[PDB]
Design a protein around this nucleic acid. Structure first.
Ligand SMILES: [Mg+2]
Ligand SMILES: [Zn+2]
Ligand SMILES: [Zn+2]
Ligand SMILES: [Zn+2]
Lengths: 199, 171, 145, 339, 35, 88, 168, 58, 93, 84
DNA sequence: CTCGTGCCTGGTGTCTTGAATCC
RNA sequence: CCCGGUGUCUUGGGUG
DNA sequence: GGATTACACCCAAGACACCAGGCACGAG
């Protein structure tokens, strides 16, 4: 393992590959086999070789590497634990990570075929067009969609209990909106006092 | 369970009370504040001994406020019950959840699972009581119970009894 | 006089006893366990429970009464929490004294390396001042290797 | 000679060893079984101080930044969560060695950020974090700045001028200062008629009064009381009246090098904006009138008025114990002229 | 005590052997090697 | 709101030249909205408590960022009196 | 509020479980230790009072104070009106009436006879007088303190108590 | 001087401060045992009894 | 009121005046302490008139003190560094 | 116990300047809270003045408890201490 | 109608090496 | 319809 | 390596960078 500047781990892995490929077949090949960097392990690149001198060779001149002779040996019994790769079932709850709904609890109603996105059921934050001629810091308080309020103040019926209002879909008072899976938190979610009162 | 206890009370006196009968005022003041009151540490303070002759000592003047502080040392009759102590009593109430027995100042509650099965609550009798053969269980009946637990809420002390054990009950 | 009346007896301080707070005692006086570094919850105010600003720790706002003592912000002293550490760490202030204790005791069972049988050491335990006694002991046991 | 293997003595390792120390050896080590038990020098649970200690401040309007301790406790709390997850998985010694040391670091600089031999913890702004140790030391810290000395109410300050036609123990006090300072005089049978006159005059006419304090503590602010004529005073109440003739006040000119830098003078209310001193007291204060300022302090109770007049008053101070001789005499013009 | 402290310090604030403030400093500090 | 008088401000939020002002009077009225009617918070500037005089001139312009920008100059006259300093 | 001669009660390293009040185990708590001290610092045995002693003292104290309130001028309902306040009226009346229906020796002649008879831990000596018993078998069951003391002759005690005991 | 070091060392050796110094009482805001505070003032109950009876507390 | 001012009042022997200046005329504060453990850990609801030090399970042996606010602050900062400053109101000996 | 008997009192029989100042202030304070005054009040109605008048006639009803270094003490009444 | 491209905002964050003398 | 308050950390120049 | 350079008052002028994401605008 080698200590590198935080955020520069992928760059160092890249740079090592360029050096390896450029020196292949020459009289001075870079005698490393592989190098990698795990996100979970901030500021540390791992380099595979037979001699320590090759590690120094791989990193020579690299501006992202700390000059102190800090290269540490990994035990064979710890190799596999370096390359470990690692829910969201329908009807389960996730927390939204982006937009006016950031931080809100939502039910994962549907999942996109390609697998890229999904569809979440969430308590809307609407104004019924009241001041039209949004951000997470200047958003509106959460409340179920009221179609008669929309009818009165500002609306397309689609189905039983389903309305499209300002180009978003509301079914039985809930917004159904697609979010990237990478924009939703599925792990260690702690329901709040307010969420226990509601759901 | 009665004891004699040597107690003391810190009394603060406003300067407008600094007259020739100061001590007599304090003696009345001590009695009004202490007699009949209960504490978990000592029990009920029943009566103070030798009230009209209590030596109050000298009063310390509080710096910055002018008021005077007396430490009135005194001797009183105190009454605290104890867990384990077997005592007699006079029943105050009878209910489906047990019986009541005023032991002087307070009353102790004995629950139904600690009452023997042969003592049966009889509402139809006139007057109501528990009527066993050759026994009397009416208001004012001497009964012998044992205090098995004392709980104090710093205002009054509540004790729970039991009559299940040997030789306890009516006599 | 600017203080509302309280029945508790007024006294002055006669002695200050210094010492350390045991782990058990810290939990006994604490009114809440602290786990989450996010101050705000969903940014809709109303201090989320368990936050560094959990309202059980106290009020610094004129319109919210303390949920522990019921008093206004002027009277309310504030109440401590506690934060459990996953692993025990050193107190930075006490390291040089910790270091001194290691050379005095056995690093397996923890017993003082000298006894009253040693004549000079028997004189050193008589020293009345705790600091000087501890130093006198360590001055002897230092060479005991 | 043999090859030695120095391993690191972790806090956890030392912690278990300390709990097995016997009570008899605990005493012999100068520790104390009830108050300073030696395993309590290792930290396992951190006390979280209430918001009083680390209040929030509003830089500009609504915007508010947090105290240095609040930010630093967030860092310890974040770092604590990462030990939770790291101990359980992906901990092949080296990984733990960087996370755990960082928790030790944050807990250390939270208490003391002047650790010798290593870089200080820094705020984003670049300046060092204000640790608890730095809160207590130095001229502005809790002890030298708020406990051995502190700012006080009922004080005043202005430029001084001399006046030969004042008695030795008098001080001329500007009217504007005399209407801001006050003394809480208790209402009795002998002064109740006198004190009602002050109440009618109100806060803006001298001689007047600013508050009436009941025995419960509620103050009546006489600036806003439109029915001031309907107040009847009860014995035992307090009236905070204006500063008036013969009241004793403590007068003081920095730097106080010796005890006659603080003497009690009798107040004489006068027009203009300077403090007036009789010319023969300039010497003990080492005062002159080239721009010097001096401080005035008003005692706030019956007990301290008597202490001022019977211990600190200016005639009692004429002879000083420093050299068993006077420290005041006839000076300047009057001394030139008397020859 | 305090009277003694002020009585000695005040003259010092207005003031071939060493004299004056440098000599006074040697005394209070109890220097082992005086000048 | 501040405790002083707001009655010397004109409708543009600015006081006009020629008006005498005393301490704690508001001379520039400005508000800031409160985040989530009755939505704003006062951010006005009062005259320094120890001063008085006459408003002399009021500059109104915009700054480099394009928002509105004001300066209010106040003049008074200081007359020598007991306590004032002089030197040859 | 009200405090006693006992002071400080500073914390100790070893806790204690013999504080809980148990009359069977002679645990009367920190205030009712065997050796007390009065308001001058003098040593003194704990003062536990039987029902017969207590009836005389309380009644005497109330009528001497009542006479003192009258400048120097029998029934329980009359003696309880000396107190001040309905709260005080209640506790005092209930205590006399309770003692009125359970004090065997209701006069000072018999009481002094019982006093001399009884005058070995001081608490047990007071317990034996309060709880009436017939035989030795009845005393060591309801009160196990006597068995530990291994004290001979409980008959004489009981026989004299029952003989002095007036009919009813 | 050595403000924080004194207090850490005082904790680790369980020091008892008997509060007899001037500085102790000043910083705790209590009347210091010096000058006007070097003694207590008591009320002379014996002297008050020479007053007439209509001055008496009820 | 600086350190040098403090010394002058000691020299005058005006102990009463010095106490008042630094308390009643400034930052006087009332705290509650537990008579057993000596800490400022008392939870005091004054309208309900109920007090409890939870650690000692003590609702009876409780005292109030008048101390400077800046001293109260000091003790809470010391508690935050694991130092226990125990305030007792009587001399054990 | 700590109290020293009247015949064996050893401290100075003159009122010190510190004892005088405390007595005058304390008595003044009590008068302003409407304590019974023991002398005739003529024209001089200030609280401090009345207290100073009582002192001059040896009529202040207070006792000084003078603590000695070991903690023992001698009680002296202000009626018996000589005032210069 | 649909894709390429610039601006605002929030979570996150650290490092190319470059005053003097008492105990 | 009472009550009603707003800033923290540094730099530079003065005053005595 | 650390420890310190008497005490008090007033004036004016400055406060957080970098990258990923969405949203709005322009062109084919
Ligand atoms: Mg000058
Ligand atoms: Zn609170
Ligand atoms: Zn061992
Ligand atoms: Zn406690």
């Amino acid at each position: 393992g080698v200590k590198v500047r935080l955020g520069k781990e992928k760059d160092v892995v890249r740079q090592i590959l360029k050096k390896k490929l450029a020196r292949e077949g020459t009289k001075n090949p870079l005698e490393i086999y592989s190098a990698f960097q795990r996100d979970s392990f901030k500021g540390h690149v791992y380099i595979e070789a037979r001699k320590a001198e090759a590690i120094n060779d791989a990193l020579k001149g690299n501006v992202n590497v700390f000059s102190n002779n800090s290269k540490f040996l990994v035990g064979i019994v710890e190799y596999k634990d370096l390359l470990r790769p690692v829910k969201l079932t329908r009807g389960s709850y996730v927390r939204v990570k982006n937009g006016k709904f950031k931080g809100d609890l939502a039910q994962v109603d549907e999942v996109l075929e390609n697998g890229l996105e999904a569809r979440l059921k969430l308590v809307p934050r609407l104004d019924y067009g009241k001041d039209l001629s949004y951000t997470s810091k200047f958003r509106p308080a959460q409340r179920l969609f009221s179609e008669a309020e929309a009818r009165v103040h500002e609306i397309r019926r689609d189905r039983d209990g389903f309305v499209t209002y300002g180009g978003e879909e509301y079914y039985e008072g809930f917004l159904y909106k697609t979010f990237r899976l990478q924009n939703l938190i599925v792990n260690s979610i702690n329901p709040t006092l307010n969420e226990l009162s509601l759901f | 369970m009665f004891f004699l206890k040597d107690l003391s009370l810190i009394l603060t006196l406003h300067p407008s009370y600094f007259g020739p009968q100061m001590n007599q005022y304090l003696r009345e003041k001590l009695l009004t504040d202490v007699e009949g009151t209960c504490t978990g540490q000592f029990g009920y303070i029943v009566t103070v001994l030798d009230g009209m002759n209590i030596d109050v000592g000298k009063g310390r003047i509080i710096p910055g406020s002018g008021s005077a502080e007396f430490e009135v040392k005194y001797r009183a009759v105190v009454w605290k019950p104890f867990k384990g102590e077997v005592v007699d009593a006079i029943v105050s109430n009878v209910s489906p959840i047990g019986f009541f027995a005023d032991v002087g100042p307070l009353n102790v509650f004995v629950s139904t699972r600690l009452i023997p099965d042969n003592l049966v609550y009889n509402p139809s009798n006139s007057p109501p009581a528990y009527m066993s053969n050759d026994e009397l269980i009416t208001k004012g009946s001497k009964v012998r119970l044992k205090v098995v637990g004392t709980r104090t809420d710093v205002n009054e002390i509540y004790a729970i009894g039991s009559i299940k054990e040997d030789f306890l009950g009516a006599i | 006089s600017q203080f509302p009346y309280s029945s508790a007896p007024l006294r002055s301080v006669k002695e200050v006893q210094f010492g350390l707070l045991s782990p058990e005692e810290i939990r006994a006086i604490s009114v809440v366990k602290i786990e989450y570094p996010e101050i705000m919850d969903e940014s809709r105010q109303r201090p989320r429970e368990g936050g560094l600003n959990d309202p059980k720790l106290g009020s610094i706002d004129r319109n919210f009464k303390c949920q522990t003592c019921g008093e206004g912000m002027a009277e309310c002293p504030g109440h401590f929490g506690h934060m459990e550490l996953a692993k025990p760490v050193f107190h930075i202030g006490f390291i040089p004294k910790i270091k001194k204790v290691c050379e005095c005791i056995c690093m397996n069972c923890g017993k003082l390396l000298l006894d009253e049988t040693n004549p000079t050491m028997a004189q050193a335990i008589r020293i009345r001042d705790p600091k000087k006694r501890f130093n006198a002991v360590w001055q002897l046991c230092k060479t005991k290797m | 000679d043999a090859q030695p293997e120095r391993k690191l003595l972790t806090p956890g390792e030392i912690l278990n060893v300390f709990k097995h120390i016997s009570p008899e050896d605990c005493f012999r080590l100068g520790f104390n079984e009830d108050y300073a038990r030696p395993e309590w020098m290792i930290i396992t649970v951190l006390p979280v101080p209430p918001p009083q200690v680390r209040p929030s401040i509003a830089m500009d309007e609504t915007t508010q930044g947090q105290d240095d301790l609040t930010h630093k406790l967030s860092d310890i709390l974040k770092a604590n969560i990462n030990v939770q997850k790291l101990e359980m998985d992906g901990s092949p010694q080296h990984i733990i060695n960087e996370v755990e040391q960082l928790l030790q670091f944050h807990v250390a600089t939270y208490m003391d950020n002047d650790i010798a031999g290593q870089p200080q913890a820094l705020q984003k702004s670049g300046r060092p974090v204000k640790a608890i140790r730095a809160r207590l030391k130095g001229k502005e810290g809790r002890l030298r700045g708020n406990l051995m000395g502190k700012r006080v109410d009922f004080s005043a300050r202005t430029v001084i001028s001399g006046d030969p036609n004042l008695e030795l123990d008098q001080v001329g006090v500007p009217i504007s200062i005399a209407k801001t300072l006050s003394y809480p005089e208790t209402v009795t049978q002998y002064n109740i008629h006198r004190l009602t006159e002050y109440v009618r005059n109100g806060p803006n006419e001298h001689p007047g009064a600013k508050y009436v304090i009941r025995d419960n503590g509620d103050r009546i602010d006489l600036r806003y009381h439109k029915r001031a004529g309907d107040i009847v005073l009860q014995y035992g109440w307090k009236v905070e009246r204006h500063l008036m003739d013969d009241d004793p006040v403590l007068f003081n000119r920095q730097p106080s090098l010796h005890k006659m830098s603080m003497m009690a003078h009798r107040v004489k209310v006068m027009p203009y904006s300077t403090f007036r001193l009789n010319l023969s007291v300039t010497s003990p204060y080492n005062a002159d009138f080239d721009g010097d300022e001096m401080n005035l302090h008003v005692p706030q109770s019956e007990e301290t008025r008597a202490e001022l007049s019977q211990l600190c008053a200016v005639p009692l101070q004429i002879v000083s114990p420093q050299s068993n001789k006077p420290v005041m005499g006839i000076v300047q013009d009057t001394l030139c002229g008397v020859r | 005590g305090v009277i003694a402290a002020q009585s000695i310090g005040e003259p010092a604030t207005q003031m071939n052997v060493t004299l004056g403030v440098p000599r006074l400093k040697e005394i209070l500090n109890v220097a082992k090697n005086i000048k | 709101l501040k405790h002083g008088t707001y009655e010397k401000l004109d409708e543009d939020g600015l006081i006009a030249p020629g008006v005498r002002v005393s301490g704690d009077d508001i001379i520039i009225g400005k508000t800031t909205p409160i985040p989530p009617y009755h939505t704003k918070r006062d951010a006005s500037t009062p005259l320094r408590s120890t001063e008085n005089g006459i408003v002399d001139q009021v500059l109104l312009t915009t700054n480099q960022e394009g928002l509105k920008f004001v300066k209010v100059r106040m003049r008074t006259t200081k007359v020598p009196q007991i306590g004032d300093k002089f030197a040859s | 509020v009200s405090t006693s001669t006992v002071g400080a009660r500073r914390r100790r390293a070893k806790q204690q479980v013999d504080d809980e009040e148990n009359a069977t185990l002679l645990r009367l708590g920190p205030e009712f230790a065997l050796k007390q001290y009065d308001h001058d610092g003098n040593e003194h045995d704990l003062i536990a009072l039987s029902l017969s002693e207590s009836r005389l003292l309380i009644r005497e104290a109330l009528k001497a104070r009542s006479r003192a309130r009258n400048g120097g001028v029998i029934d329980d309902d009359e003696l309880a009106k000396v107190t001040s306040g309905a709260v005080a009226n209640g506790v005092v009346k209930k205590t006399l009436d309770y003692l009125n229906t359970f004090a065997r020796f209701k006069d000072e002649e018999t009481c002094t006879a019982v006093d001399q008879l009884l005058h070995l831990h001081p608490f047990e000596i007071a317990q034996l007088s309060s709880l009436g018993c017939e035989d030795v078998d009845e005393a060591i069951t309801l009160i196990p303190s006597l068995a530990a003391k291994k004290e001979v002759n409980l008959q004489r005690i009981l026989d004299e108590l029952n003989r002095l005991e007036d009919p009813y | 001087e050595e403000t924080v070091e004194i207090l850490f060392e005082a904790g680790a050796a369980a020091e008892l401060d008997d509060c007899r110094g001037v500085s102790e009482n000043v910083m705790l805001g209590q009347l210091a045992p010096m000058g006007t505070g070097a003694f207590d003032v008591m009320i002379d109950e014996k002297l008050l009894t020479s007053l007439p009876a209509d001055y008496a507390p009820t | 009121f600086g350190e040098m001012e403090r010394d002058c009042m000691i020299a005058h022997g005006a102990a009463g005046f010095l106490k008042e200046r630094l308390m009643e005329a400034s930052d006087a504060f009332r705290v509650h302490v537990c008579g057993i453990c000596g800490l400022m850990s008392v939870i005091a609801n004054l309208k309900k008139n109920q007090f409890e030090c939870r650690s000692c399970k003590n609702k009876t042996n409780i005292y109030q003190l008048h101390i400077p606010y800046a001293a109260k602050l000091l003790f809470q900062e010391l508690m935050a560094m694991n130092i226990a400053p125990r305030l007792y109101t009587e001399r054990s000996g | 116990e700590l109290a020293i008997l009247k015949e064996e009192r050893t401290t100075t029989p003159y009122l010190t300047k510190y004892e005088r100042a405390r007595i005058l202030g304390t008595r003044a304070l009590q008068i302003s809270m409407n304590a019974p005054v023991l002398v005739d009040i003529e024209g001089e109605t200030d609280p401090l003045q009345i207290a100073m008048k009582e002192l001059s006639q040896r009529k202040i009803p207070l006792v000084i408890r003078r603590y000695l270094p070991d903690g023992s003490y001698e009680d002296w009444g202000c009626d018996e201490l000589i005032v210069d």
